Amino acid sequence: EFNILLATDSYKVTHYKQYPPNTSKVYSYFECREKKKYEETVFYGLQYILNKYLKGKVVTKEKIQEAKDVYKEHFQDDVFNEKGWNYILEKYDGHLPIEIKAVPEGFVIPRGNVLFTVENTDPECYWLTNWIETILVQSWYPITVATNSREQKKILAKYLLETSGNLDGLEYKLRDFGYRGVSSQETAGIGASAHLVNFKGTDTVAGLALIKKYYGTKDPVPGYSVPAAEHSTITAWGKDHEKDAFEHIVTQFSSVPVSVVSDSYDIYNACEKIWGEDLRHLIVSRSTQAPLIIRPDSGNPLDTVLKVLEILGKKFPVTENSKGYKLLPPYLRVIQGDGVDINTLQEIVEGMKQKMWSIENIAFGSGGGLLQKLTRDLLNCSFKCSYVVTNGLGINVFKDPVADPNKRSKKGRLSLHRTPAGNFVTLEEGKGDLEEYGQDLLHTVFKNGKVTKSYSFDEIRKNAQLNIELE
Template sequence: MRLNVNKIILSTLIWLSARWVADTSPLCAFVPQVTHYKQYPPNTSKVYSYFECRETRTEPTKNRKVKYDKTVFYGLQYILHKYLKGKVVTPEKIQEAKEVYREHFQDDVFNEKGWNYILEKYDGHLPIEIKAVPEGSVIPRGNVLFTVESTDPECYWLTNWVETILVQIWYPITVATNSREQKKILAKFLLETSGNLTGLELKLHDFGYRGVSSQETAGIGASAHLVNFKGTDTVAGIGVIKKYYGTKDPVPGFSVPAAEHSTITAWGKDHEKDAFEHIIKQFPNVPVSGGEDLRSLIVSRSADAPLVVRPDSGDPLDTVLKVLEILGKKFPPTENSLGYRVLPPYIRVIQGDGTVGVCVGVGCFKRLRVQPDLNQPASTHTPTEAFLIY
């Protein structure tokens, strides 16, 4: 995936706006900022602010050391295009904000005059300037990631008004940074056990769609994961990438057909084998003739369409090893050039339940690596060629 970073390096005056569904500009600020225009020193003409990922934690009761010393800058372009671009202010939005804040404060403290000034002079566009490092950059903590400043002396108060929207970039930055750190772990053990990085971009798969707070959260978080990887079951992220970033790839993320509890248990307790045979036949990618048994159906699959076994219960460290041991007895592995056993290309293992990010990733890889009698997932062809640590 290639991000169109040119669109977000904003070095000249841009007029920004937001649209109101739940986010009209006069109503999308942290409440104290509504009255800040009255609190600046007299004759203030410009406010200049910046955003960084702090070098240390601010909570005195916690370990002040941060988890990672670098962060991946991602997500600003989405915010600018979705919320801060085009015409933002209308008479209706000003009136709505005036009424909401009057009720909220029980006083007329809303800066109606300031917003009407923007409406009349700039046709509802916000006179602020934003400069940023290119998205996708890996930046040491404590460095400026983007700056914001007002460009009209009458609108000095506007700079920090947009802070509430802009600081929401913490979420895609966090996801992209965590994803990158896990990618580094995967790369380390992939090199140690296979000698190359083939398929690395497909080794960490996003299963998070059902575990987030909203559709928008899903899109933002999944798109941040796609900065580092191409495997995702959260299709909302693909929409964000295509709409707000653009990519030369027709689809920036990929997945495969997969079963769940309901599609297996629906066959009944005594028909689990029938369920698997049926599913394999539904998605063959290879010719299937009548009368074949389950094992031959699996063996006949190509390396580009393997059967992927996804264990769902138990301790992931123990379960993955047990599954590999069982599969190794039924589908004899081969030994790669580094002495690790590799399952045949038509069958793979993916772990997506009960994992704990980096810690489980390191533990699982180390345990697989030090036990040569077990079957080490290989790096060869597909997005599901190795167990997944998420």
């Protein structure tokens, strides 16, 4: 079972003996630090952490004993603060005397603004604020996944609109194929749920479980999949029966959309000779709600997509849409699911536009690119202390490393506000109290063991909308 006393960076165990004596309050905050592009970030995932790890009776005699033993061996010394934890146990029945305030989930906020704040509500637990930093800062992952996915949605939005005239199908243009390519089951589910803030397509079904348990949606599920082949279900037929494999698969799923990987031996041959001639009569008969979706999976992504399009355009009846771009018949589409991240996605859709193919023709699939190749440096997710009370006096604290001003931190008690022009600003040094800027956008989400405000996954989806969607 989970033990919050063991869920921190080892060294923080020793911190109680390091803060200034007579310190009654430690107040800290999380931002996505500016860097001298990712200009705005989606706030998502804290609620998952509050419910699964922070809430309820999280301290027990047994959890205290257990930590005392591990820490003794781990440190070869008895540094563990047993009294402080016992105090939380006896006084508050093992509930954390902490208040967390946060911007609403889904909100899209410029870099360098306070996203949430954490402080102790009992003077005895000044050390507790930064003990849970480690667990709280992991919010970086769903924040960064939601944000990176959204930036990609924007690109798809841009090219789809220009090549086709509208935004139909946008929410199915970037699918999550990342399940096998992430570092754990837990990560898979978290990361998958973060992608669902922006899209509806995923094959990482753990993602749905998390959303239902921790956020909730009107509809039965927030994510959807279509029947799709893998290399094993094609190659299993044998090197000389790829066409037998192809034909069996599209007949099994003649009524639904169906993705078929087509590069097991030669993608170009399969497209021009197998889909294009031998099996042509099985494609052109299909419904518009049941297209075949050809899936190349190797070679240079831009080059291979353009070659596949060019091939199909000459085997199938292409039309020119109202904006002047080429469109395949409704029963035929293409998905690129190899080597896709934000960079090559941009490369592909630009390359398509240059060659006069609509973005309607294509969907993208992303795995490690979407959920794994991302770190805390991407948005500079950082948890820093900015206010303390020592000897009954509050003082405004911060770091300001001389060789890196980008790592300067904010001062004092903080609040987030709407500017007159409708943008965002963070006020420092308790300046929010002057109330010249209207109301604090941060809300109490956690206080003394209790989750105090929650958001449905729907509200979240609505908060994270593109402006282009909003228009």
